[PDB]
Amino acid sequence: MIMDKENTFSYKQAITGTAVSTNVIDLGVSRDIGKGVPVPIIIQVVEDFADATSLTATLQTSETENFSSATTLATSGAVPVADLTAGKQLAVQYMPLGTQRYLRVNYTVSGTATAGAVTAGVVMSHQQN
Amino acid sequence: TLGNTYLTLADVQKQKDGKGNVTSEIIEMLAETNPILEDMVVMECNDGTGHLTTIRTGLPQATWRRLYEGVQPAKSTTRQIKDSTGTLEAWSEVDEKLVKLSKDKQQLMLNEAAAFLEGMNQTMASTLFYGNTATDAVKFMGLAPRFNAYRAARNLKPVDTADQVIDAGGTGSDLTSIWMVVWGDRTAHGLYPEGTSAGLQREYLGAETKELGDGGVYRVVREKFEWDLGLTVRDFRYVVRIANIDVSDLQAGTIDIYALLRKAYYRLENRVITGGRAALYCNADVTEAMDAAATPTSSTTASYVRLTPMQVDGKEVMMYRGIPVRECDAILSTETAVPSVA
Amino acid sequence: TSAGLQREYLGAETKELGDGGVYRVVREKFEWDLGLTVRDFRYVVRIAN
Fold first, then answer.
1. Which residue range forms the structural domain that includes residue A59?
2. Which residues, listed in sequence order, are joined to residue B181 by a DSSP beta bridge?
3. Total domain count for chain A?
4. How far does A17 lie from chain B, in Å, by closest CA?
5. Which residue of B has its CA nearest to A121?
6. Among positive and negative, which fits the CA dihedral B186, B188, B193, B195?
7. CA-to-CA distance for B161 and B236, rounded, in angstroms?
8. By CB neighbour count within 10 A (0-12 exposed, 13-18 middle, 19+ buried), where does B318 fall?
9. ∠ CA(C26), CA(C29), CA(C32), 5° rounding?
10. Number of A:B CB contacts under 8 A?
C-alpha cells in the first residue's frame, strides 16, 4: 500500500468513542473522482477492538469545509464487534461516485471501546493478499 | 625476622646429592603446561595511549516514506574501548659465598633459573585467565573479569558480554569454565608496548655489591626475569566462556560436555564466518569428560556412540570441529560463581 | 523505480534555517522499495508454532 500524506483521511487515528477523521480532504473545487479511472481507497481497521458493539465508518461528503450538509457516498454498515479485526476493509474497494469539494470519514460506534484504530485514505494500488 | 628469599642454606643442602655435589635431577612435581602462552598471537601497541577499538553502538532507523511526508535524517552512534599491557618481573639473588660453598656454580644457577622460568610462565597463564584490573590496578585486563556475569534469557547478541556465556547450573565450589577464543588481528590478541620484546626477557647481570642501610656490603649474584604482556579482546563476540561447570557432576556423568560445546560454538556466531585462528582452552577435567563422552562405557544412562571392540579404550581428543583443544593448566576448578543477569 | 537498495550522493546543499541562518550541508539519501509477491504459494510452505 503506497499511502501518502496530503491525501490521507487519517493516519493511525484511534477509533474509541464517536469521532470523525482527523484530516478532511479538500479537492480545490467540487469536481468528481469515482468516475473515470478507478481510485482505490481503504477505510480499514488497523488495530483490534474492545467491548464496543459496532462501528459505522461512513464516507461523508459536503460542499462546505465544515460538514453541515451530510452526504453518504458509501457506508460500512453496522459491522459487528467480532469482525473489528486488523485488516478488515470496512468499505468499498474503490472510491464511490459523486465526490464534492470535501470528504470526511465519520466513525459512529455503538458504545465506547478501550481499543481500536483505523488508517483510511487513497492508495496508489490497493494490495490484495 | 623471616628467612624468606636469598636461597638460604637449607635448600642448598637439599639440592646436594649423596656424593655431596649439587644435584641436576631436581624432580619438578609442581610443573604446569600452558599452551595459551605459545599459540596466542601478539603485536605492539604502536600508539601513545592504549589499544583503541571502535564499535557501532547504534544504527540509524529507516522510515517507510508516506508520500509527501518528511523523513527525519538519522545518525550513526559509536562507542569505544581501551586496553593496556601488564608487566611482570622476577629477580634472582644469591650470595657469592653460598654458591662458592656449593661444589658447582653452574648447577645451582641452572636449577634456580629453571624454577624462575616455570614460575613466571605459571604466573602469566594465571593472570591471563584470571587477571582482574578492577582489584589490582597494576595487572592487565584478563578474561575472567570480562564475562564476569552471564545472561540467562539469552538475547541474539547485545553489547553486554553476558550473552556470550553459557550457564551449566554449577552452584557450589567445584565450578570450572571452558574457553573458546579466536586469535587474530581484528578480533583478539596479545599486546606488548613497543620498545620491549615478546616472551621472557631473561637477563644475567653477574656479580654485584649489595649494600645495606646499616653500612655493611658484600657480593651478590643476581638475575632478571621480565615479561611484558597485554591481552585485548576487540570484538567480544569472538570469545565464548562456558561457566559454572560442577566438576563432581561433570565426572559423575550429568553435565554432558558436548551440548555445552555446541552452545558455546553457536554463541560464537562469529569465527564460524571468519576472523582468524581459534582455540578451546580448558583444564584436565574437561578433556577427560570429552574423552568420557566420546568413548562411552557403563557411563551416563544413554549414549549414541557405538565402539568397535578394538577401540573400547579410547583416544586423546585433540581438535574440536577443527578447533584445537589446547588443554591448559592455568584454569582452576575453584573459580567463583558467575551471577545470572536478566 | 530503480532496482534494489539505491544510493544518491546528493552532494553539497544549503540548509536554510528558519531564522535566516545558512550553512552548507551534504546529504546522502538511501532508498529501497520492493514487494515479495508470492505468485504461487504452492512453491512455499511454512512450519509454525
1. 1-129
2. B239, B279
3. 1
4. 27
5. B66
6. negative
7. 7
8. exposed
9. 175
10. 15
